[PDB]
Design a binder for these strands. Structure first.
Ligand SMILES: [K+]
Ligand SMILES: [K+]
Ligand SMILES: [K+]
Ligand SMILES: [Mg+2]
Ligand SMILES: [Mg+2]
Length: 136
RNA sequence: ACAU
DNA sequence: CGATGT
């Protein structure tokens, strides 16, 4: 329908999938970058999209903000709703860091509360989410 | 199929 | 063209 401009938008960026994963959150209205995660050497697109939403939840909660979060990831929105990131990525020494962060994000969700609406960014209608990395 |  | 996901 209408974009809710008073919101936080998040997105993953990667070099390969699986590959190097990062994410960022921006003010939907202004494009101001509000947070950026240091690149993680191996992860998946969906793991990064999940981490980005959870980081957004933590960021808004710390600031007493009731703004919604936009994500373009059907998968990550569902994983956050379920409090469970159902990634297929093998757990081995190479993937230990991303899996540690995902495990810690799930743990945060299981021990905290939030009312933040997590909304699907409608890329087909509105173009690329404002947190997009411009790499595609 | 749809969403990345 | 390849991959991650419901
Ligand atoms: K997109
Ligand atoms: K991109
Ligand atoms: K597929
Ligand atoms: Mg995305
Ligand atoms: Mg993007």
């Amino acid at each position: 329908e209408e974009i809710i401009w008073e919101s936080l938008s998040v997105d993953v960026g990667s070099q390969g999938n699986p590959g190097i994963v990062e994410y960022k959150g921006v003010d939907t209205k202004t494009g101001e970058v509000l947070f950026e995660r240091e690149p993680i050497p191996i992860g998946t697109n969906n793991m990064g999209e999940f981490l980005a939403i959870v980081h957004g939840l933590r960021y808004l909660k710390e600031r007493n903000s009731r703004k919604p979060i936009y994500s373009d990831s059907q998968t990550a929105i569902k994983w956050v709703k379920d409090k469970k990131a159902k990634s297929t990525l093998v757990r081995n020494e190479e993937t230990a860091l991303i899996w540690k962060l995902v495990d810690e994000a799930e743990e945060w969700l299981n021990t905290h509360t939030y009312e933040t609406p997590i909304l699907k960014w409608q890329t087909d209608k509105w173009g690329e989410i404002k947190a997009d990395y411009g790499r595609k």
